Specification:
Blueprint: E1 23-25, E2 35-40, E3 44-46, H1 53-63
Antiparallel strand pairs: 1-2, 2-3
Organism: Homo sapiens
Protein name: IL-8(9-77)
Amino acid sequence: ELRCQCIKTYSKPFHPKFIKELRVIESGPHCANTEIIVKLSDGRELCLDPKENWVQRVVEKFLKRAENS
């Protein structure tokens, strides 16, 4: 199952290119609410809150890019 590994999230906004690895966690029975999880280049890990418009815009601008082919 693996429930939400982030009990709290990030409400303050920040520039995305700093994130070396932006990976969001999917939702399901393990966790009804979806949670984001970026990894700052300084070796930090901050879960983001999609309730804001910057977290969802930052994840969209960071995810929307060359993926394959």
